[PDB]
Design an enzyme around this catalytic site. Structure first.
Site, mmCIF file in Angstrom:
data_model
loop_
_atom_site.group_PDB
_atom_site.id
_atom_site.type_symbol
_atom_site.label_atom_id
_atom_site.label_comp_id
_atom_site.label_asym_id
_atom_site.label_seq_id
_atom_site.Cartn_x
_atom_site.Cartn_y
_atom_site.Cartn_z
ATOM 1 N N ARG A 192 0.857 -1.233 0.000
ATOM 2 C CA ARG A 192 0.000 0.000 0.000
ATOM 3 C C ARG A 192 0.865 1.245 0.000
ATOM 4 N NH1 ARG A 192 -2.403 -3.890 -0.593
ATOM 5 N NH2 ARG A 192 -4.725 -4.221 -0.582
ATOM 6 N N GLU A 199 1.997 1.710 -3.466
ATOM 7 C CA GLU A 199 0.901 2.241 -4.264
ATOM 8 C C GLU A 199 0.694 3.746 -4.034
ATOM 9 O OE1 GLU A 199 -2.785 0.001 -5.261
ATOM 10 O OE2 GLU A 199 -3.688 1.518 -3.937
ATOM 11 N N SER A 212 15.328 14.693 1.300
ATOM 12 C CA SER A 212 16.262 13.652 1.698
ATOM 13 C C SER A 212 15.596 12.420 2.338
ATOM 14 C CB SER A 212 17.304 14.222 2.678
ATOM 15 O OG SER A 212 18.304 13.246 2.927
#
Ligand SMILES: O=C([O-])C(=O)[O-]
Ligand SMILES: O=C([O-])C(=O)[O-]
Ligand SMILES: O=C([O-])C(=O)[O-]
Ligand SMILES: O=C([O-])C(=O)[O-]
Ligand SMILES: O=C([O-])C(=O)[O-]
Lengths: 156, 156, 156, 156, 156, 156, 156, 156, 156, 156
Positions: free
Chosen positions: A96, A99, A122
């Protein structure tokens, strides 16, 4: 003297052994980190092969998990980092997060450049944390905060 | 009646055209989203092919960017999502987010299970935002907040 | 207002058009960069789609190459970076630099950790230059200097 | 008689053994190379499976690390080189060097051809080194020098 | 001034156009290279996008093939080399050479180190040629001669 | 009765054991092949898992290397061939032969069709050898001869 | 004079045009090959970019399909073969043939070595055909005959 | 009760053990299948991990090969099929069948649809056999017969 | 006479054009399929390039969508199927169905073998449908029914 | 305290051991799941490394299969999910389910958006089951029911 790894499998094998011990002792990551002076996310990442523990902390967690001397020493090595087995996570829980990048990665880029300029946020001068927050509509939510330093890309 | 795409390149090509127009007009994502009633992250993701705009929002940004009718219609279609060209970002700015996962992905899994249980943090019942704040040590930081619903995995 | 790209092919197509004009005018990268106030490696990287030019530099190179207005604006956009077509270079000249990493990548990690500590040498707070020098044994050598900031990874 | 390897895992497994012994003895790569007459980058690469040690150096480092006779023998074999596990580094430290190529790879090609002509900068008639330099703005920088012979591509 | 490419598709597109003109004129590679003073293998490789022609050779083949001025200019550019579409050839003719490496690649490594020492046989200081020879058992054979400079890998 | 393998790792593991024995005994591939009546390239290829040895040669090399009976039997099995670990060699020495194909693969196809016709140069009715030749300009060259039967592709 | 292709897309684009013309004329592959004197599988493979037509056949099929002169010429070129888009078929009908290899590939190897010896069954000195045969249990079966020459691998 | 596997390596490791036993006993696949009542291609495929033997056959081959009880049990398990290590065979013998599909795969699709209709030729209701026969022109050929059920694709 | 495709992009390009028209006309898939006598899943898959329409249905949907004759003809071709761009879906909606297989794929295999025996559940003699069902706890659920014929794998 | 895994191979190795014991005891998955109060698909998935068992269920299946304490403990850990070895199944039985997505994946996306809206059918708030039923035309069919919650994607 600082010591570093080059093959992730040594520390990832150690992670599996740590997790078995942890499960046998019925311990939480919260209690393992408690008393080290270090954030739960940092200590956990270290157990899982993605950070190095300072010596005292490595001895402390090594005492709690009944680890041998070579294992306590390995925990102090700077890791060959990279927790994803093969580029794209197979696990739903980890996926997830990937995604969120597939949906918002270009938006993150666009708004980073708009707010800060050319350059990056960073992943090194960086910290993350996970908080559980009640959902007003019912249930629970995680608030994961990614907090990274802006480093500009400038002409030279 | 709702409409959906199956090939990402239609909306991604539209995105490139949007960005050219946006540059020619010297516009910000902040001002494009202004007056939509919608978050900058959401509107931007839509322009970039990763979300659908409601009709009113699409007409509004379409007027700002001088988009033709077919383009305004396309902005309303449910996209075939996926902003990363070939799985791993090549762009340093996008890549750093992926690297946060390479370092912390298993920690995120571990702490989500400890804090919430078996299951996931959703990428659907989900929002994110980017804030710029000064670093107390000098310079600037991004605080990117990922905010997702916990959905349990239960036996059946 | 800063403007940014999300699909590398827009700037890479512009690079090809730039290289054809460069060849028709018989120009060098050195002469293109001269008068910009900017290093040859930076300006060249911008032409090739991997850096952004400040407005005056974009207008200047655009005059030398007879670029149209859209092209000059595109050169000012922050690029979606990534010059390697498919992860591993096919071109022998580019490939040799990749091979230097296949041979020395782990040594660079080990020596960076020993000399500086945990963390990274930045590719952002960073410059590169290419110098041609006679080889004392005869022939010529390139000295490529990679000069990056050390950023520590610290516990927290 | 010269001897060569065909499977990198033999020397890579040896490298892991060497790093554990090194950590147990709290040794640095600088101490290990000292006395061999060979550059630290060269000795380090050998330990890590990417170079062969001459016999006297293999015996000297072997003594320092308490290695058995087969291990000292293996260090003298010409390796099957390739330190990156799967084409693109997962480790942030090694990754930054790969990103320098994703940003500047085509610029290196372009300037090498302009300065020298068609052909390559060798990865074989080649040396590198890592120097730590103070950053005038505060902090530290690494200057990594890639020094390779130009070999021309000529018609025949 | 030398000019170089960064995207193989420009020259590979020219190769397709050259091959169509070649077929329409019913020409051979042997005829095309005749008069050029350059080996058939080198001139052929250049037409196919893998070498640069000197200006006189480019004009000569360009007259034979009726090429326009931009095409004759493109042929003198240093190419972004890489003739295999996606790493492993799909074409049977080309594939057999790849299979010779799958079968004898480690033998070639082993015998190069034994005969010459650590290092490589160059693909740059290098020539190839193809000869047809009668097979005493009946039929025809190709003798393909790869001829490269040994470059040693030495300690430093 | 002929016997054959289906998993390359059995013979590749044997190859590694062979190389360690070979190194302990300080033997050359030339001396191993001596007395077998077989070309060094063929015998070497068999040791390295890519050819089968006839029984007499197997027993001869098995004696020289002190192999057990199962190892001598394994050497006579028809192998599951494929010496490259993951499609593209990582080792510079092996890699150069792959690069010769990335540069000249399409020329080899074109000149094979022109000289012989449609079809292939066989990798089966095939032999290879490696000769060391002095370079008139200084140094040494390898001349590697690939010698394969032409098999035509004909309509039917 | 024989002519050859190096980029499969030229003949694959022509295949798509051929298929659209064939569909418009409601033609079958059997009637396209009828009168050519050539096997239906060979003619069909040519149309689809995988074989070269003799000139008379090219003109005959060119007339049936209303092809222009460049298309008729292209059909006579020796193709850059490879009909599968990306290594593994996505189409169920083609996929089944790949699956026959995932199931029986090692058995084919084993029984070929047992019946014939070391070496191969050729894909070049080779023909195939597709016959339809009633299934005694009801329905229809295809009997696809793969008929290739044995080429031995022998020591040298 | 039927039993099934999920990790191919268990049966593939058994296949290697069986092949060593088979070689030590100097057996053929033909002899091994004799007395089972089952085709050599089916019994061989089972030994190699791609089919399940019925109990009586498993006991019969287990006796011929001196297999232990766990191995005889494993041979009866329904396998996790897939004999190709990594999608494309490395072995020349297996590879030729893959090349047959690269050349003729679209032709087989086209002629299957023409002769039968939309749908597939089954890889399940399917048999294969290998026959050796003299080539009328000299030498030997394999006739490999793929015999599968046509399954239509119909609208619904 | 049946007609087939060999390159998915022709029908997938048609799909994008269909989807723009469908959107301009504000049509649903339900209404497009209505009157055709074919299940909405089948008609929708055909529009999307994954099934063929019989002639009458093609003319019917062609009329609703204002398609030209070539387009209506294209709809009747047997497609080169494969809707996923590169093996793994990038789109969340599509991806969840892939994840169902990452979680339950081996369970599906295991339970199919236990209930039916060795063999497969067909994807050819197969139908799918999607129903919306109220969730007793609030909200909505999809019940997607996969319904396929068992074909056994039997000894021969 | 909840415990979790990060390397799938621990639980996958446990699955192989479970499957051997299961076969030795001649058990079915139905019988194993019986008495657990949990669905056969859920308990099977846990045995195969893709779900976690509650303690009582773990002890119960542990008794039936004679598992040791570590094994019973492992079955209660939340898994690192992902049952497919390398993205695309090699096994025909598992592969057919993947093919159902290659044919219908974009149809599923289209009909889900039409019926429910923008968002997904969850793979988390989700169950499936496998039913065997006679086919009216003879033989047997599997009815596999995928049942997942709709989660909308909404502007914010
Ligand atoms: O990501 C989600 O929300 C899901 O699959 O349920
Ligand atoms: O990620 C970083 O901080 C960098 O590369 O400088
Ligand atoms: O890299 C090299 O030096 C070469 O190939 O010649
Ligand atoms: O390589 C070969 O010789 C073949 O396939 O015929
Ligand atoms: O291959 C088959 O037989 C199928 O999927 O129906």
């Amino acid at each position: 003297m600082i010591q570093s790894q080059i093959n992730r499998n040594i520390r990832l094998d150690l992670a599996d052994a740590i997790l078995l011990s942890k499960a046998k002792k019925d311990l939480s990551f919260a209690e393992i980190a408690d008393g080290t002076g270090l954030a739960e996310a940092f200590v956990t990442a270290a157990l899982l092969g993605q950070q190095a523990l300072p010596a005292d902390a490595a001895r402390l967690v090594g005492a709690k998990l009944d680890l041998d001397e070579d294992s306590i020493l390995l925990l102090q090595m700077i890791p060959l980092r990279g927790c994803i087995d093969d580029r794209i996570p197979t696990d739903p829980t980890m996926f997830r997060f990937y995604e969120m990048l597939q949906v918002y990665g270009t938006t993150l880029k666009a708004l980073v450049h708009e707010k800060f300029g050319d350059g990056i946020i960073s992943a090194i001068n960086f910290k993350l944390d996970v908080k559980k927050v009640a959902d007003p509509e019912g249930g629970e939510r995680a608030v994961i905060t990614l907090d990274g330093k802006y480093l500009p890309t400038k002409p030279f």
